[PDB]
Amino acid sequence: GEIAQTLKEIAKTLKEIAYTLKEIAQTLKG
Amino acid sequence: GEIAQTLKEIAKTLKEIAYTLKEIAQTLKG
Amino acid sequence: GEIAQTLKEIAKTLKEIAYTLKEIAQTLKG
Amino acid sequence: GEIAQTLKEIAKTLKEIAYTLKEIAQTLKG
Amino acid sequence: GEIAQTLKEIAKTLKEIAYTLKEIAQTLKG
């Protein structure tokens, strides 16, 4: 269904956000 | 329906957040 | 019901997060 | 009420995220 | 089912995001 597919898209985007924030956190530690 | 459309709006805002985070990560590396 | 209203609240909080990240991105660029 | 409880948890975590980002934005000003 | 499981995964990823943002905030506050 459309709702289940949209939720899978949201989950995938959140995993990208989680990854980018870990990159940022490491950059801030030098 | 309203719930499906609200989820699509959530997905779109998350893509904007993910792109701004990539811009921040790039700014921190110069 | 409560599910539709909570989704609307989530969408609003994400718009706030998106705008605070734009503020952060701008401050880091000076 | 499992769906409603999970959405309320997501909403609560997003409020925490929004406040931590406002704290970050304040620190970087600064 | 699938929708309930996807929402639980979204909740878990948001908790990870919230933790990494607390680490970022602490690094920037020294």
Q: Tell me the DSSP string of chain A.
A: -HHHHHHHHHHHHHHHHHHHHHHHHHHHT-
Final resolution, Å: 1.3
Distance in angstroms (rounded) separating the CA atoms of residues D14 and B13: 13
Report CB contact under 8 Å: E24, A21: yes
Q: Which of B13, B23, B28 sits opposite C15 (nearest CB)?
A: B13
> Hey, what are A1's tokens?
């269904």
Structure-token match 């309203």, residue found: B2
Sign of the four-CA dihedral D12, B6, E10, C1:
positive
Q: Which domain holds residue C16?
A: 1-30
Q: Are E25 and D20 in contact (CB under 8 A)?
A: yes
- Half-sphere exposure (Cβ direction) of C4: Cα atoms closer than 13 Å: 6
Distance in angstroms (rounded) separating the CA atoms of residues D21 and C7: 21
Number of domains in chain C: 1
Distance in angstroms (rounded) separating the CA atoms of residues D25 and C18: 12
b/e sequence C4-24, b meaning 16+ C-beta within 10 Å: eebbebbbebbebbbebbebb
Distance in angstroms (rounded) separating the CA atoms of residues D14 and D8: 10
Chain D 1-30, residues with CB within 8 Å of chain E CB atoms:
2-3, 6-7, 9-10, 13-14, 16-17, 20-21, 23-24, 27-28
Number of neighbours of residue B4 by Cβ within 10 angstroms: 13
**Residue E29: DSSP 8-state:** T
Report CB contact under 8 Å: E17, A22: no
Residues in chain C: 30
